[model samples]
Target chain A: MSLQVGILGNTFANPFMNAAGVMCSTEEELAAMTESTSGSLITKSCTPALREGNPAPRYYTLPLGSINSMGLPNKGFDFYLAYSARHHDYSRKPLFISISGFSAEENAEMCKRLAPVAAEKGVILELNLSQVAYDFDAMRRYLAAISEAYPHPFGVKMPPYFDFAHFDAAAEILNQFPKVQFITCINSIGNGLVIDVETESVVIKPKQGFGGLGGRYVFPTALANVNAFYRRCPGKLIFGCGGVYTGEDAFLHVLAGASMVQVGTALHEEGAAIFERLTAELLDVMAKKGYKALDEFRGKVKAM
Target chain B: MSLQVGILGNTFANPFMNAAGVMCSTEEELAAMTESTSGSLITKSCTPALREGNPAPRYYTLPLGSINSMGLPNKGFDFYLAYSARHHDYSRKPLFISISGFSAEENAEMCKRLAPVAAEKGVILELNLSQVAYDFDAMRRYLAAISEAYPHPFGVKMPPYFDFAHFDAAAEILNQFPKVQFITCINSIGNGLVIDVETESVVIKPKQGFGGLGGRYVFPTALANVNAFYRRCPGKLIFGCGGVYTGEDAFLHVLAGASMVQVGTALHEEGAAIFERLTAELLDVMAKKGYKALDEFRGKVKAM
Candidate 1:
């Protein structure tokens, strides 16, 4: 197949489609507007049941970055599946599905149930490992087991742990299951919160405490870790994310070594069309640079 | 004071006015550019020493807000005293000095030290209670002691807390201290973080596992809170903040009940000159509305 670049996950109901926690609740219409440009589509992180997750004030933004505490509020995997079956088809571009879990068993069950649907729809499973807040050992085992059971292409995602010690460890364990086709490195770090100065109080409530952060402020750290993992696991499929709001940013990650790029947080600010905008900007950059495809600049970065 | 609408408190330091990391070493140059329209200058948040606080990634900007983990990073009080004593005297507008403390002792010490300098320069003291990592009870007490000791025209600042609860508590405490003149509601909120998608990691170090969220995203919450406090604390002076980037935004705060207003992260991004632009914009709004002074519509917001 010709080397092409595109999105790997779903935007779901996010009208902004920029980051977590920021949603338009009417994302399908927006996604339809963007269907033509992207290479692939992975639905927003979905679970088996509809979840109202965390409460308000679940978003944060910093100098050049942003943070959100969405609490994984969603319309249930069944709704997603039905929605996906009707709206998301893989004929034009590859499609991927991302799911989160609180435990290994839950992850396994999610994968198994979605497997047949994924295979039928010609989609790949992009499992989000960041939500495994409890036991990673069992999560690893379950991932391996799920890969075998699903018998379809699968990918695993890791959160941005400051140290890549856990990354290398997880990479080793994940390597045991050869069927795991790709690994998406890094999700938003954790819960972030902001205070309302007028009341002299924290804004978010009902779901007290932290939220996730994102945007340009997160670029440096995200870039460092992406480069680290790319160097360690040479030739392994990697997805780059964090603070990617522009085509140049996406192109930079490709130069540093990302096979696919994922967009987060930026959508919260710019709106869902941000994806289309990025792709449009990327195309302009590509034309300006006379680059033919994504692979043309993959991992081509150097220190001057 | 003819209801003077002033540029809250912002400092232009020579060599640099360091606060929250990122050396604004060129603030003197920057501030000179903004002086014509800005009614007042507030020195950068000054500590007791030439404190080299946190490193890079100190300031984070969201679509509508910003979070700065620049720990009391600034030219020590000694430097501030000398700098303010010099350039501050030549200014047409009044200068407000923002003071910080790690504890009550530090606050008292700062007051004792600055009272002479403030009196000499005829500058006002803005007792800042905005600290990302500090004890609140002690902070409140610390401000009270400072008010009691120096007993100068001062504005006490508080970061957004959880409800009318903190406002009531802090306001009551300050009201008891007659030395406290104005209450600037809200500092920024949290020790928030941002995740970069391209790098697949955090853009900044995770501080205290959370961050203070600010900007436009949090404006509604901030306004609602501001309006609430306006109702309860009728005559108390309030400086409204959060997600204010324009004259309209600033004026809305005034209409909503703030006696005066302060601008932070936005000025950092838009540059010190942003004050003039914002001021001009607000002036246009006032002229169009047939208002001559700031208090014409101050606290005139209708609760719909």
Candidate 2:
């Protein structure tokens, strides 16, 4: 028996994938993930034009995890679109492109062009929803408009929401559109600062050392959001992100209702080799529980 | 030589305090904290009107932490204000009032009435800054206006931020007021859901089991926020909240630049008795490092 999962009329060889912005920054890196045991791979979040991101020392690693304020640095939308067009081998696995824009109009323009391309190539699109700069109303309107523009099914990668009102409100806005078929639970725990106490300075250079937190730090919140949205938007698929360094973490995510899991900080730290280890660990855990497949426990968390 | 610390023109036997919402919801709870080893205690977050909070099963505890959607349950501003007026005891330890009004004007109204009273009694006021329902700009303006209306020093309890832009923007807003003397590093990792796998259902009753996350799950993000605000707002003191269960956790908070630490979910689970263990454990860690005072290593995390 193999760890197979299906979504959007496609089957994943496994439930694991590389989260956007980790090893997906370049075509070479994306190719590395494709060659690895990961079930799927996503491209780096691309803006309309190429961005160098924040200044040097924008990313830092710690024993527990990593912090980065890459500021959405990528080779731009066309670069990734071309790469995906050339190498979207569904025989290998499904491919996804992550899109971010400096503004709503920019986002919509990118989507306007990429939607048809995605449909033609059978590629999935994931809109980055962690842009706090956009007002909630504007974002809602933008999402609705973009969904209309993008004819094919796509997903959203969200930031962790910490309030019930936000969960209810955001879900309300998201549920209004059927085209938004999948919701990626969490981006990173944002704006965390790691200080070098010896120098009395921050670790990351961007915004005075403030960066998004990932790895072991975010597991609970990641599981929570996956489960939260799973309960709120019954029809929408959930791709779990954050704190997945091991099979146990992946198991926890699946229990919380994630149809798929995306690795971020761990992938950055361990490279492509981490996928095989994670796959083995996940299968071992499943076998221990006498579960033969992913569906038996996906979204099956206990209530007592 | 003891672990005593001074802030707001008063000395606390230790730097530990009860986070606003936990173990301080009622007079009985408040009295119990006063009798405990914790250096200080705060009132539950009070609104203009009494609230029963979200609904039953609004809080659930996990092995790693707890999730709650208590919905700001409290006995109203007047109820707590009257209680504080009657039980103001600075000599025993400092007392603080946590305020969270439904509207900005209501928040200011509570501040306007309570500011003078708090000053007269030397009681500190901690404004809840985790209200996602309010717009960020409005909250900033509200804070500024309330600061002008009130004549005494006060603090704010904030939610964790995940972006450098948010940190910079929020710090700019907070730094505008010299009277905003302290900033609490976090409230709760808000809107997280916990599920029990066996039942395949949501754990809590409110907003489909979505609630604030606390405990080990939030430690890294909690530390990051403490350090971020500590660096961004050098003029202000910091009170670390979230993910603190042990003295080691409390120690980490201080090292990340928390002048004081507050305990929430852990306090709920372990009761007031947990404070003694935490204090001793903190002292043990400090002594092992050959430090006699919190300042020796406060905000002194190494970066390499």
Candidate 3:
């Protein structure tokens, strides 16, 4: 029910809309929005080393979804470390760093290194497990492996799997690893493609088969998964995502079980000011709902 | 290949990203762009009478597309007539006015009267067929009917249909009417919705359901329809639009047999500079292809 909003990791909002790739440089964009009314800032997703990502046309949209093959492009940790140097004076807003890796060891090392780095720089470290390299066992092993070495307010950002057959197995794995301070439900969906039939060619031909799709189209799927997870893990913390462009969107995530909401795409479409807009809308919704604070409706989803 | 780069209606390359119901209140954005850069500027889709549009949140995005019940909002012809009262200051930039209607009679009336208005103003009139009303007969009859009333260079804008059966029928009807100059391949694809599953609710809850989806996601679908019509209606002008945000995107539309291209959504992300950027990109493509005009590759769609 806590009303404060927070963001996860080193992801940058695409100026063109909510996309994965960095269209312009990320640092200048973040700097532009540093004074935003939003309560927090999350840097672009970062790893220890820099990555160039896939070639031109890495984004391909589908109705209700879009996929991107960014290959997790980043200016790397050194850039982020340097970028944050300028942020040392800001006091009103908090900053969170999202870190990912291609392997469990790499992820663990990232956490171990970043936890101290973030703490030293007055930032929080969020563990996003829904990157290209994550699978059930790999994430589980990664989290279990890093739980001790990288002891911070660690959270696991996971995806909404359509196949619920492994639900129990997945839930069991999470339950076994209690160090994950919170959870972010859902990430961009697929490396989907839009092929031009007339040309008989893929619209966005990525060396990788497809890219991840995200936007309002996938919000419901994300909410349902978050709600289900909350229902199952009653005491667990949850950070809801997917298709949240307005405060009302973030509100839906809250009612569905998120303690806090992450704005990825909305920030893309509406600009950094979306966070402020969401906060204002949330305040209005709270007043209208006759609630005094955010804690009033944690996991209070009602069935129609 | 002859290359012709077109600038679509109302290239107000500023912060005002127009949708179905929005009006272009200021030419301040338009005055800022390069006048001679684009082949032409197509103004906003206007109507016989003024329209205020449905309401805010008129445009709602889906996972793969967007839906808007834009309700054809506009400032009407009277305003446009007065705004462009200047008698003879036309640019080599060909102007196209996209007109809308609620009834066949109104459509014909507007087409008839506006052609002279456009001719006097040194611009072309393009008829936008609103299939959103589900009036197929009206569309078929209206285009042909107006050809007799309005003797000017005009074209019909087709709505995006999953099944081109309707398009084929319309194409056949349009071919019979010489008054109809050419056919614009698509308007946006009709209304799509994104549901919030956890709350069992609609996300945007648009008052008019949702309007058509646009963006690169629907490029192939739009191109397929355009190529189909181009191949079927030889010498017919086809305005290809689904998702064109770049010159390469415009080039793709042209290669797919689009005589001209009307780009939407890209401006939503890239801002008004999109017009200049895309036009430049189009010329670059034209040079690379060694084409002199847009028509050179109009039907040059080679089967792969």
lDDT per model, in order?
Answer: 0.58, 0.83, 0.58
Best by lDDT: 2
lDDT of 2: 0.83
The candidate 3 chain B region of ten consecutive residues with least summed lDDT is: B13-22
- Reference-based lDDT, residue A27, model 3: 70
- Superposed by TM-score, candidate 1 places the C-alpha of residue A168 at a distance from the truth, in angstroms, of 15
For model 2, residues B1-304, the per-residue Cα lDDT tens digits are: 4678877898889999898899998888988898899999999999999898887888888877888878889989998888777775566888989998877788889988897678678788898878631356876777877787788889988887765567778888888889899999788887676655445466798766667888876776788788878888999999999888878778778888899899998899889999899889889877777789987878776553
lDDT of 3: 0.58
Ranking, DockQ, top scorer first:
2, 1, 3
| Model 1 complex DockQ against the native | 0.04
- The digit string of per-residue lDDT tens for model 3 on A1-304 reads 2354333343222111222232223777666556666555566667789988767677654544455556677888667666665543346555556677676677777776676666666666566666331356766777778787776666666765532333455666777766666667777654333444334355554532334557755565577567666766654677777777666777777777777666665565567667666777777767766766566676776532
TM-score of each: 0.54, 0.81, 0.49
lDDT of 2 by residue, A100-184 (tens): 8767678788888887777778788998878641346866877877876777778988888765566778888889888889999
lDDT of 1 by residue, A49-141 (tens): 888876665555555565465777777767656655666655555656667766566767877777777767766777777645224577677
CAPRI tier of model 3? incorrect
- What residue runs in model 3 are displaced by over 4 Å at the alpha carbon? A1-304, B1-26, B29-36, B60-66, B84-88, B132-134, B195-205, B283-296
